[PDB]
Amino acid sequence: FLSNNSMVLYTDVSQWDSSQHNTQPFRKGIIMGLDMLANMTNDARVIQTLNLYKQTQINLMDSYVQIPDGNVIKKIQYGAVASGEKQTKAANSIANLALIKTVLSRISNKYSFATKIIRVDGDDNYAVLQFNTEVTKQMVQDVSN
């Protein structure tokens, strides 16, 4: 759907690991989802697994980090998300998806477009969109700002 009437916003998201949107809301959202899912089952083994996974997300919400510097060792408060996990990749894809879905409800205050495609792969993401009319420089600039 690339055309003279369409545009595409593409964006690198590789620095968004220490960010303020990978802390508390992400984990608590997942915890809430687990609560819903817990109320969506009857078996007990599963609920045990879910409560343990929940508590895992609790522990990942507050997490300190061994780092040497010469001989002595620093340990820093890092209650957020990064790679190095069975969950991190797909979960980061999710989180970037949720983030961009959250961002994307603001161009709608000033433009009419039909979201044709959104894509997220790790350290980047891009969405293409087509308009009711043809594109100009001023609309791209103002949209960008």
Binding site: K28, D35, N39, I73, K74, K75
Partner: protein
Amino acid sequence: VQYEILQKTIPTFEPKESILKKLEDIKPEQVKKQTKLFRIFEPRQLPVYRANGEKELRNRWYWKLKRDTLPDGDYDVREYFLNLYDQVLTEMPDYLLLKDMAVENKNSRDAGKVVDSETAAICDAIFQDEETEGVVRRFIAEMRQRVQADRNVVNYPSILHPIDHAFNEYFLQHQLVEPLNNDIIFNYIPERIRNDVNYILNMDRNLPSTARYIRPNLLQDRLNLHDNFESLWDTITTSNYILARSVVPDLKELVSTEAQIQKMSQDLQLEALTIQSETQFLTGINSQAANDCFKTLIAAMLSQRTMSLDFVTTNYMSLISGMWLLTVVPNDMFIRESLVACQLAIINTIIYPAFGMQRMHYRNGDPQTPFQIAEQQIQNFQVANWLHFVNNNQFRQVVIDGVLNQVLNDNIRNGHVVNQLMEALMQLSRQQFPTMPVDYKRSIQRGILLLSNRLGQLVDLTRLLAYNYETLMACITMNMQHVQTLTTEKLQLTSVTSLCMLIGNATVIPSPQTLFHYYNVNVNFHSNYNERINDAVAIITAANRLNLYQKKMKSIVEDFLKRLQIFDISRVPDDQMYRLRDRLRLLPVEIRRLDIFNLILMNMEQIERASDKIAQGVIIAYRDMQLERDEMYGYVNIARNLDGFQQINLEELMRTGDYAQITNMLLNNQPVALVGALPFITDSSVISLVAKLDATVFAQIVKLRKVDTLKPILYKINSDSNDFYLVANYDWVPTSTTKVYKQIPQQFDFRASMHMLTSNLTFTVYSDLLAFVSADTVEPINAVAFDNMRIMNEL
């Protein structure tokens, strides 16, 4: 060795979190047992002043309020009374035994007992006073507890205000307990379960008539919540579905999967060197899905939750078992587009090519499903009667025992519909495929033979499902509506074939403990539903009969949903709450709440005449009127009739600030009355009386318009006022402008405030009613259905 630290400020997200439960963990209720006797007034010694104002060597007991805490402004007073109504309803008890709270009178002739510690305290105080009459001591000596144990009844003395008597007597005469016998234990159980010889019931107890029990409120949906509150309905539907999954039995010994599937393998004559569509028939013929389908189907059909299909058209056996499914189960029970697509596929690759027809030219939004048009396109007696049945397959909505029921045909229950279908299939097997090759015949006919060699087992399976379905239908309290849901369950037809292919001569029936659990949970939910409805209806009908105009009817509904610990209050909007409110307005109130509110209505003003912090208004007539004699004050600036002068409401002035009238009346000294809740101060002087200060307070109101820095004066005069020699010597009747609109306290009548509260003696109350019942099932082979004929018999 050393460790180093780098601390870090952060934000903190704060959800609402909408605390949930599931049905099995919902606790039923906790009864209100009574605390102290719900007093509103209490006595108090005050001095007393004889007429001419001077003082006795004696005191007197007067009624006063407990907790004078009332606000300024009538709106806030109506708020107070809303809170008061809420408190009494929060304190309204269900049952009460008086002996637990009773105590001993220290002054009874016969050494008898009384009801409360404070009653006897008052008695003792009045006993130890030097200046109290002998008659109240005589009264205290005659007052005792009476008993008639043939009837299990007691009558205890109490001393309390007449309104208090009204409340407590209402509690006595409307305490919801009934005599309990085993006949009521029986008749609380449904008829269908008593009429079922596959469950046997007994108990090892004989309760007495001294026992008691609370009857649940299993009243129906006043609100029609199936009508356009579809989010909650989908939630509820899932919330019953999950409950239903908890109670379907796990299957007993099934036939060996590998052996049955070895037989399938032998009967198919596969080849290791071809693609063979037949191969896909084996997709998902495991155990653990047979059980899954068995649970999912039944829990859906009981919960009235729609369900959707996922199926790959390359697997024809999936379709071939979905045939049976869609035949024996109605079509509106599934979501429309799924089974439309599935039936359409089935037609366009098994059926119309056998009799030599076009595939189809079927529309997406066809107002007819393909089977309806196909009822008339075909030429086949069996299939045509079959399609007629299909078109007229639907539930029967019938109200039995108060609850609605989606009852089957009574030709579906007993599996006979399958004979029409299977006869049609026999007359299809015998067909040639004039258009299509012989390998395709071979594949199709072989697949349908795998299901045609299980005729009896499928009939028995359907009958078994039907039995458990009706048996669980009988254990419902909430009426079961037929309206399509938002959300489905993805059903795999591989699990259906797994179900249909692994069964023989073993029956699963719900254990009675599971039944009783399901029933008690449904009971508790329904009773919670009705009681919270009744609560909320009470508050709404209260608030609309009181002009609580600033109040915003959102938090009430939020509390209503919070007490139902399964809903998402943080993500329900306001419009839905308000529509729920709009329906709630039109409902009748229950008898308890309606009566209590009527009492409170008729007596709130009388209650308001008390509370000696605020007076109900003030007149100003620029004239030196006379003062009235009283005997707890002396001469006071008090009014009690309000005749003459025209009255301005002050809450009306706060609402509609128009100070033109009052201002005009003040410059030109025009007389007026002023109505509205108001403080005062108690000026015990004299020099602030003659100077006529209580008119000085209002001239700021024209300067600064805010009527909040408004504090009237109260001109109290007595023998404890530092200047009472004046009234003795100078011989002047006091006179004052600006009387106050107020009533005096009511003198305390010891005789008439005494009452005798009557109640039962020593009953017991039981809640978990089916704990006394022991229950068991017949042997599963020795079962029997409605038709008086063994299900699960074909071998």
